[PDB]
Amino acid sequence: SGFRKMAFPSGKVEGCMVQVTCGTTTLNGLWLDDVVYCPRHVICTSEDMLNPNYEDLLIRKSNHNFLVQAGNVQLRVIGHSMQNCVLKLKVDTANPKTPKYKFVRIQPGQTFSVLACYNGSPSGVYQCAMRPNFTIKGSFLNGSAGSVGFNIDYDCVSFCYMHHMELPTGVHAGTDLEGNFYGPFVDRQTAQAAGTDTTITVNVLAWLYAAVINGDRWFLNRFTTTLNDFNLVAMKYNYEPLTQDHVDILGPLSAQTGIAVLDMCASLKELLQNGMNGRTILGSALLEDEFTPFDVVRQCSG
C-alpha cells in the first residue's frame, strides 16, 4: 500500500537525449532513428526571439551551423527541415538505442512523465497532468527546452510533449512531437497568458478511491446524488462537469471498493461545500487532481 506521485522509469528515453547547438543557443534534442527533433527556436539569437521570422532564419542556415552531440560523440547533420514548431535534423547515424515508439497527442486531464534535461543531459523525472487550459505545472529552468514528456505502454514509448517556454504565471507550454502547440500559444517572446484553469473532476474522484483503497474513509457518507445535481454544484466551484463516460472509466475502482461512483460524488459534493476542516486525505489537505483513474489502478493494483 501507500500512494505516491510516480513517474515512468526513464531509461528508454535517456538514451535518446542529445545536445543541439546553433550559434550561442544550446538546448536539448530527441534522437530517434536518424532524425533529431528539437524546438525550432534553437535557430534564434536574443534579437530574433521577440519577433522571429522562422522561414527567413532557417534559409540562412546550413547543415554545418548545427552542432549535435550525443554525450562524447559528434553527430553529423546531413539535412534539416522545419515541421510546424519543431526542427527535424537528419543525421548520418541512426540511434542504436531507439526504442519502439509513437507520437501521440494527449488530452487535458491526462498525465505523463517529464524527463527534464539540460545540455542534453537528463537531470530529473517527474509526473504532471496536462491542465484544462493546455499548460503544465512543471519545473524547468533556462536551457530546458527540448525536454520531453512520455508514457510507457508495454514496450512502447509514447512521446506526447516537447517543452518550449514558460508563461508569466510560472506555468509551462510546449508542443506535441509533430510541432503543434498545446493551447493557443506561439514560440515568440511576447505577452501571452493562459486561460483560467479548472479542476479535473474525474481525477479527483479517482484519487478519493485511492484513499479508500488505502484506508482513508472519513469523508464517506451514505448519501447519493445524480449526475445533474452533482454537475450543478461542481460548476460553481470551477470543477469540470462529469460525463457518463467518466462514470464508466471509474468502474474498476467502484467495483474494487464497493462504493458506487454517484455515491462517491455525494462525498465530493460535501467536501466542496464544507471543506476538510483540518483533516487530510492521503497526506494532503487539498483535493488532488493529477492522478487519472488509470494511474490509480496501475499503482493500487499493478
Ligand X SMILES: CC(C)(C)[C@H](NC(=O)C(F)(F)F)C(=O)N1C[C@H]2[C@@H]([C@H]1C(=O)N[C@H](C#N)C[C@@H]1CCNC1=O)C2(C)C
Instruction: Decide: is 95 part of the binding site for ligand X (CB under 6 A).
Output: no
Out of 36, 114, 165, 213, name the contact with ligand X by CB under 6 A: 165
* Contact positions with ligand X (CB under 6 A) in 69-88: none
What does the H/E/C string look like for 192-223? CCCCCCCECHHHHHHHHHHHHHCCCCCCCCCC
CA distance 35 to 16: 10
Q: Which of 177, 148, 179, 176 is nearest to 13 (CA)?
A: 148
Q: Which range, of 38-46, 85-93, 139-147, 240-248, touches a second copy by CB under 8 A? A: 139-147
The least distance separating ligand X from the CB of residue 22, rounded to whole angstroms, comes to: 13
Q: Is 284 in the site for a second copy (CB under 8 A)?
A: yes
> Interface with a second copy includes 247 (CB under 8 A)?
no
Please say whether the beta carbons of 218 and 124 come within 8 A: no
Q: Between vectors from CA 273 to CA 271 and to CA 277, what angle results, nearest 5°?
A: 55
Nearer residue to ligand X within complex by CB, 90 or 188: 188
Instruction: Kindly state whether residue 23 participates in binding a second copy, applying the rule CB under 8 A.
Output: no
Q: What angle do CA 126, 128, 134 make, to 5 degrees?
A: 145
Taking the complex as a whole, the smallest distance from the CB of residue 182 to ligand X amounts, in Å, to 13
Stretch that binds ligand X, among 4-12, 139-147, 264-272, 277-285 (CB under 6 A): 139-147
β-strands 35-39, 66-70 pairing: unpaired
Residue 71 binds a second copy, judged by CB under 8 A: no
Q: Which residues contact 276 (CB under 8 A, 6 or more apart)?
A: 285
Which set of grid coordinates corresponds to residue 14? 535517456
Q: Is 27 in the site for ligand X (CB under 6 A)?
A: yes
> Which of ligand X, a second copy, none sits in contact with 170, Cβ below 5 to 8 A by type?
a second copy
Footprint of ligand X on this chain (CB under 6 A)? 27, 41, 44, 49, 140-145, 164-168, 172, 187-190, 192
